[PDB]
Design a protein around this nucleic acid. Structure first.
Lengths: 73, 102, 72, 85, 50, 90, 246
RNA sequence: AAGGUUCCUAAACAACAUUACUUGGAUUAGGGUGAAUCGAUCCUAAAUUACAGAUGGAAAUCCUUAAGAAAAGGAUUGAAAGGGAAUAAGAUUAAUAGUUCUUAAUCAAGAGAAUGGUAACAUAUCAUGAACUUUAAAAUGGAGUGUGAAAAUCUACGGAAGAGUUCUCUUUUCUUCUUAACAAAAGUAAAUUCCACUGAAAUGAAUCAAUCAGAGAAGUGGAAUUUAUUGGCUUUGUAAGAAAUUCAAUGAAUUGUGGUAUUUUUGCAGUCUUCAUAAAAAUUAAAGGGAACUUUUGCUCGUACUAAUAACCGCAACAGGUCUCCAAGAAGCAAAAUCUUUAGUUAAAUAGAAUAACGCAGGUAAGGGAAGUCGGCAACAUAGCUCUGUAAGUUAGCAAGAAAGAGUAGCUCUGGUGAUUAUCGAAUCAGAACUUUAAAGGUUAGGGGAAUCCGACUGUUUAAUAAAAACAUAGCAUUCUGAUAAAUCUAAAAGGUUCAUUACAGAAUGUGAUUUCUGCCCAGUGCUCUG
RNA sequence: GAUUCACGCAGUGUUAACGUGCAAAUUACUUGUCAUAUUUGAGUAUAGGGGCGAAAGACUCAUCGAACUAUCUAGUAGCUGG
């Protein structure tokens, strides 16, 4: 598992067609957009809720998006 | 105080069967096979270890980047910098000496 | 301690099953079978063991392709 | 263990081991110099003493002349006054 | 043992297959005196030595 | 700490007076640093039976089994030196 | 009767040499033109310790003159040889320490170690630690030279035999008294199996011919003929003189 | 390793477990062993065996790279403890799981003629590199000291949840508060080796110890490597969604920070010791030289169970024997004896009653104290630690824990031994009052002395009546041998051992440390001779 | 190749226990020893007038002053029993 560090690559990565599925976990303070690519699992830890919303609109409709909470699916 | 068991069929504390005990979720303690300790490279004239090349397994050098297993210099990777500074002076001072001798 | 005490370390097998005779008579260290004379080409037969001949010789098995020829 | 801190039980009839076993003689001297040689370097780095004086004190400590830290700062204090005469 | 060769495991497998008693219907034949297996053994009585 | 049995005091009292005195001469030489012919330092330290390794400047000099140069091995150096020079000129 | 310990030592069951950590065969280099009629140059890469002998072995690294590549060798170290040395091994070589020379060029009285016994067998005579053979004379009529072996016997050799100049290193080894049994037991780490030696007279009559009766003694003269059968050949064989020399 | 179905479940109890059994490792019938990542498979070690050749009446023996038109240089086998490409956490089953399921990775084989730094050296594959050659890794003894790191135990501050005691008290006692493989670089260490500036004497630098310097110390600034995967520790993705502890009847709560403490593990640094110098190849990387992101596959074999006071070997559920890994508290110098926590068991050739003799095992005793007896056999007695003191003899090292004498408890105090600029932390030593049943002794725990004989010492031996005064041993000494030899195996042999050797060596012997001394005898029997 | 404690190992004494035993050589206490001439596992080597032996005629599958198994062999017996 790898971690992306800022908005530049995460937005670029989602637009690419290699993405298999996307998971978002909503913790008490932050949120991780654990996108799952062909090989690794990249996650961006966002603390600003406004910056997560623009990330929540960038996912293409052709992949499965699962929103997790304090209860596992 | 948790007592562990070897996870492989090896039951003897040989050099190849070294293990490390680590903690695990819930207080369980598990067993991991830690690798051996190896020597680095040595200069071909003085027998001293060379700098810039890690001390890893012979096959693990293949996975390293092409600049992570050499040193960028003449005879870089097989002779120390002192081992090479003397090579140049020998190859040059000798040529000047027998240039005028004959 | 030549009796019961010293009989505790007997777990290193010497004779394993042979391939041409099927008895447990293949000496691992000598690399030859003590009952049917392995890699030696000839079957090991001795005249003093007249019983060891009638235990395994011609006629004691199935005779898969010889019971036919003699009948003909 | 709380009572043993005040020395309630550390008598003579409650010891079954040799004096060197309970208090090793090597580790009471390994620590003794590390206490002293740190002070000598501390003063030399600070500038209280010089290299020539700190050299005659490095060997004097090494020869077991000063029993504790207090008995070394007194000798440095003494040998500094003879310097200005 | 834990580590047995292939030609050795299949011979053990036959020695547990042969360690079975007479089938019930066989003993009910006519003139059938084969009531019990006398070639049987057990792990704690006789070591098969193989 | 000991009047006369210096290095062979580790043998205690159990080899004889003469042998412990004889071995005293050899164990002393075997464990001493000699003056190194090349680097010119008291750094030559034995490594094996007849291999003296100059720790100062990293050279391996061969020599006697317990001394850097045996007495009979120094005359031969002079004997050959005397025979070489005379042979050259007449 | 039985077969005494000298009769079981010839079969080689447990009496084989323990030569497993030994470096290799220490000898000169093969004879060739560049050594018969010229000189080569060898570099003493490093001095090593071949287990089971008191003379260090030096790892000389020549150059292949006929082909491309190194020609690594293994020379017994003469005393005084050091790492990084240049030793020349040829017929025209200079008479220094370690330079291999044909025995027919050394001046009379020259010290030569590791002398061949026949031209081309690469070292026979004077190989042990601290030993050397001294040239005596020359004879140009039949190209033979006399030398004095370390045993004192004088032998006549062809003048083409090679012989490294000097004495062998590791001299004066035996002057140290082995003090214990353990030190003498570790000395045979890389040799045969002969250390704890049980006396013949402390043996039953079958094992050794000296097996005594109700008193521990020999009973018959120990000086025997050379033509005794193996097994009865004990004691001193063909003794010209016995007893302490006065 | 050995055993082989003993493993799990159901029915059942004629036999077997020195009574009985509803129990069983026993009867019958079903079920169970999942691998690209663990091993075998691959490579070599001590060693082993083939074609041709040599030897041999014969069986067959010898050579293993030498004899060969054989194999670029030499054939086959040889290790489940040596070398080795790559995997972890949670969960599941009546049993299998580094093997299955979820999640997350890794390896191999494919498929789609460059810059920077003064220098040490450095750049998410990059930045060409054939023949031939070399270097290095794989790859290596042991002892003792110091230290970095992790885990366990102990402990400091602040807590969250539950459990135990409570008529006598206790802000009390206990449990839980965790995290992998593989990767990232907020912050930050110890050690070692190098580079650049300057050139040390009034010599310095430093360690517990050492050790180092004008072929260059100390100082300042840098570089590289090791430290259980990347980069050692904290931290981060994995990852809380798992797990542990609680509450409610599937749904809810929490998971800070330290330590100048003890042990274990794993590395690093130098020091010491050898008449000991403490493996090979597969396989991999670099150099010298200049010729010209995705996707596919990963085959075969083992995997159940015991590993023992009931699964192995001893005729058996035999007090015998059998190689290893993990390791809590009290107490002490101690992995000692004794007691307890997690875990296992209360059954392991049957019990009840009475409390005779003679017994096996364990004890005690008045007065005397070896008078018993072959003989202090057996038993009793001294025993830890601190201080004082310690003879003759002696190889000057030892004798020596010689012998002998004093102290030791409990409670309340005081002082000494350090880090940072008053706080904080360690068990250790010393001293003073007061009290008592006057104190190592529950357990562990030397009897001492004066002489004589033998063996020099540590060591080894008659498995099953002899453990020594015997054997060995270092020391002394004797004999032969120049290597095509000496010894010496084979019926024979370009055959074999010492010999991968070479007189400071090989072979054959007697005496048995050190000190002192080895006397006279060559007639006899051996050996030898240049007669 | 110092003195000792411990895990282990041995077998000095009781000539203790047992002696139709737990045991075809074991048990308990006492004693010694407890890393360098140390203990031990696996593989490999040495085989009967042979091997191996720090030497006791000891060890060589409960067998050794010449192993076990089979052939000569129903060996011979002036000797004992029927």
């Amino acid at each position: 598992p790898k971690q992306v560090q800022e908005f530049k690559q995460i937005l670029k990565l989602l637009k690419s067609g290699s993405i298999r599925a996307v998971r978002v976990k909503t913790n008490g303070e932050n949120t991780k957009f654990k996108v799952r690519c062909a090989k690794y699992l990249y996650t961006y830890i966002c603390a600003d809720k406004a910056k997560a919303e623009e990330l929540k609109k960038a996912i293409p409709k052709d992949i499965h998006v699962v929103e997790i909470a304090k209860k596992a699916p | 105080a948790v007592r562990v068991t070897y996870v492989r069929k090896h039951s003897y504390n040989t050099k190849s069967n070294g293990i490390r005990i680590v903690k695990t979720a819930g207080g369980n303690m598990t067993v991991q096979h830690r690798q051996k300790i190896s020597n680095g490279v040595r200069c071909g004239d003085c027998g001293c270890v060379l700098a810039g090349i890690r001390h890893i397994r012979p096959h693990q050098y293949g996975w390293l980047g092409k600049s992570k297993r050499t040193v960028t210099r003449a005879y870089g990777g097989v002779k120390c910098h002192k081992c090479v500074q003397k090579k140049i002076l020998r190859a040059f001072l000798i040529n000047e000496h027998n240039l005028i001798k004959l | 301690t030549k009796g019961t005490s010293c009989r505790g370390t007997r777990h290193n097998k010497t004779h394993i099953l042979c391939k041409r005779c099927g008895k447990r008579s293949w000496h691992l260290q000598k690399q030859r079978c003590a009952s049917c004379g392995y890699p030696d080409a000839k079957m090991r037969q001795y005249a003093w063991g007249y019983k060891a001949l009638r235990r395994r010789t011609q006629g004691t098995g199935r005779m898969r392709h010889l019971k036919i020829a003699l009948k003909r | 263990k709380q009572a043993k801190i005040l020395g309630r039980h550390t008598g003579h009839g409650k010891r079954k081991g040799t004096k060197n076993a309970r208090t090793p003689q090597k580790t009471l001297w390994i620590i003794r110099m590390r206490v002293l040689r740190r002070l000598l370097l501390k003063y030399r780095t600070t500038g209280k003493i010089d290299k020539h004086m700190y050299h005659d004190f490095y060997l004097k400590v090494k020869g077991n002349q000063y029993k504790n830290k207090k008995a070394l700062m007194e000798s440095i204090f003494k040998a500094l006054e003879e310097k200005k005469l | 043992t834990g580590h047995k060769g292939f030609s050795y495991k299949l011979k053990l497998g036959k020695k547990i297959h042969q360690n079975r008693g007479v089938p019930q219907w066989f003993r009910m034949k006519t003139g059938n005196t084969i009531n019990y297996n006398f070639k049987r053994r057990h792990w704690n009585r006789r070591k098969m030595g193989m | 700490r000991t009047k006369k049995v210096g290095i062979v005091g580790k043998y205690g009292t159990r080899y004889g007076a003469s042998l412990r005195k004889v071995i005293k001469k050899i164990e002393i030489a075997q464990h001493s640093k000699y003056v190194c012919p090349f680097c010119c330092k008291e750094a030559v330290r034995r490594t094996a039976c007849g291999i003296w390794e100059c720790k100062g400047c990293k050279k391996q000099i061969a020599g006697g089994a317990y001394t850097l140069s045996t007495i009979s091995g120094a005359t031969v150096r002079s004997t050959v030196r005397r025979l070489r020079d005379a042979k050259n000129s007449q | 009767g039985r077969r005494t310990l000298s009769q079981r030592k010839g079969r080689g069951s447990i009496f084989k040499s323990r030569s497993h950590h030994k470096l290799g065969v220490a000898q000169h280099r093969a004879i060739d033109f560049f050594e018969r009629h010229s000189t080569v140059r060898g570099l003493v890469k490093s001095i090593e310790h071949d287990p089971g002998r008191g003379a260090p072995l030096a790892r000389v690294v020549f150059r292949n003159p006929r082909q491309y590549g190194l020609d690594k060798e293994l020379f017994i170290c003469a005393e005084g040889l050091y790492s990084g040395q240049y030793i020349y091994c040829g017929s025209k070589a200079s008479l220094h320490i370690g330079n291999v020379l044909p025995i027919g060029q050394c001046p009379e009285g020259t010290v030569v170690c590791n002398v061949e016994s026949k031209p081309g067998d690469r070292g026979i005579i004077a190989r042990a630690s601290g030993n050397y053979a001294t040239v005596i004379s020359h004879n140009a009529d039949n190209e033979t030279t006399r030398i004095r072996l370390p045993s004192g016997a004088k032998k006549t050799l062809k003048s083409n035999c090679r012989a490294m100049v000097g004495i062998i290193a590791g001299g004066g080894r035996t002057e140290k008294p082995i003090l214990k049994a353990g030190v003498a037991y570790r000395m045979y780490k890389a040799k045969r199996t002969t250390w704890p030696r049980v006396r013949g007279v402390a043996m039953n009559p079958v094992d050794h011919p000296h097996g005594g009766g109700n008193h521990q003694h020999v009973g018959h003269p120990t000086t025997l003929k050379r033509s005794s059968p193996p097994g009865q050949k004990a004691g001193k064989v063909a003794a010209r003189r016995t007893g302490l020399i006065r």
